[PDB]
Amino acid sequence: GPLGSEAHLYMQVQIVAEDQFCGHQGNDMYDEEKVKYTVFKVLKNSSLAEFVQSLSQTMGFPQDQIRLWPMQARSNGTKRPAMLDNEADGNKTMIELSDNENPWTIFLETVDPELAASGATLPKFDKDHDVMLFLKMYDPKTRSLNYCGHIYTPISCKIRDLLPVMCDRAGFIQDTSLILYEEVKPNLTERIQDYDVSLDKALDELMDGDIIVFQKDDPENDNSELPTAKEYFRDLYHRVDVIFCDKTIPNDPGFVVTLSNRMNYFQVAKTVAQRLNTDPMLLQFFKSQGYRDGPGNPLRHNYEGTLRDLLQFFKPRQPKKLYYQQLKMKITDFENRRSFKCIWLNSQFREEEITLYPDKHGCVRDLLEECKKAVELGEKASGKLRLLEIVSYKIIGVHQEDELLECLSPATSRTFRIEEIPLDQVDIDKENEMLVTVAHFHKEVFGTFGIPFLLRIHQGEHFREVMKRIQSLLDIQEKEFEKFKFAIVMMGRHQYINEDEYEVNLKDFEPQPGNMSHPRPWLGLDHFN
Ligand SMILES: [Cl-]
Question: What domains sit in the chain, N to C, each tagged with a CATH number?
């Protein structure tokens, strides 16, 4: 709004009283966002003597029973009460004393007016020999800080001589053994190891406004989540609230979880699984996307980073959120599963698209077993399955149940097919029977189509007995079958044979002796689709 003619000649003095230090659970004396002040609009060029005189009348106390301690920022980022000499600096301006700080905050120390009535007065402070210390009591049972006021103490005073005051102010029985710490700054609470020394030795850079945090040395402290003041402040410093959303639930508002920035994957999962009444092993988490919102890349269960590492891209404004999903299997096995898409050839000689999920480290047997569990077999068939490999409508291979799945081609040009072994093909006479690959082709051998299949052929068998065996499987009209042309194919070369000749010798379909690698001779079926 509109500024006054002399508004620039004024400054704001914020007076904080000791009652504002009670109940504070964080570092330093109070929270800048929760603290309540007495605000003074003071001339920048008016003296300290005037303010101390004015303030005493305003606050309702004699001038000699009040002492001002300006709130001062320290090099380490803390704000603490500092010493101010009213006798020496009484004629100095408010602006030169604040060192151009506006608003200037000052701690106002006063006697308890209840005690003042019972004789009490503000003691004299020897700026060269005395120190003003603040006392806090940490209670591991309630995991909280209790304010125990301040003391005027000589710098040369032994720590051991401060223990009766601490016990008294905390409500402990005298000669209770205590653990003492110096609250240096956030995430730095240094234990006082020797009490038989002066304050100047005991504390690093002994100053006015220094804090000693103390607690009982009790075995019951160990029963607490945070047994020491040191662990309390560390937990306070690293504390972070994160929202967790289910990736599978659309527009899920999520739930808030209080975690620590230094938590590992196991610790983050264990805490979220407790809130979901699930096993941490049955949860998958996703990284952040940084710029974009929504879930990012899936987080490996063996992630070696911290929660800080996961939340580093959220801006100060940005609310911290992480996405997850609930699994119906252990995370380790879920990560190791392979999506195996194949064809299932049913009893009716019809093809069906099936997706099986064996473990990537499994074998052909495991894929077949997964399939056996999913389908209905023949009326009274073998109950044994096989995995074929088809490329360009031809069977290029029959895989043994012992073969690793990792060996099977990931290429899109391969078609893997599972089927039930026909009764006649379970245990053939190795001396006079043979399994041959059959495939349909239109005019030219390269022009293959249809569903290929394995066929049993016998030594010196009548080729029409082979023909009716083919007809019984294909199952079409007898006049459609008479149009067919039967030929044997091997390495491009193909010879057509007479249906009435009946010439069947296993050597005609066998490859060269000792060559199993070379594409074995097959039987072609000429017609059109
Ligand atoms: Cl942190």
Answer: 1-122 (no CATH), 123-238 (3.10.20.90), 239-335 (3.10.20.90), 336-528 (no CATH)
Q: How far is the CA of 238 from the centre of ligand 1 (A)?
A: 4
Q: What is the DSSP string of 461-493?
A: --HHHHHHHHHHHH---HHHHTT-EEEEEETTE
Token reading at 211: 């804090």
Residue 393 · residue 400 · CB < 8 Å: no
Between the CA of 231 and the centroid of ligand 1 the distance, in Å, is 14
Token pair belonging to 118:
């019972």
Distance 160 CA to ligand 1 centre (A): 35
Other CB atoms within 10 A of residue 212 CB: 22
CA of 58 relative to ligand 1 center, distance in Å: 43
Six-digit token string for 477? 């009209």
Report resolution in angstroms: 2.7
Q: Of the candidates 464, 502, 495, 494, which has an alpha carbon nearest to the alpha carbon of residue 482? A: 464
Distances (CA, A) of 236 to 69, 224, 232, 311: 27, 15, 6, 17
Tokens of 93: 């301006």
Q: 422 near 380, Cβ under 8 Å?
A: no
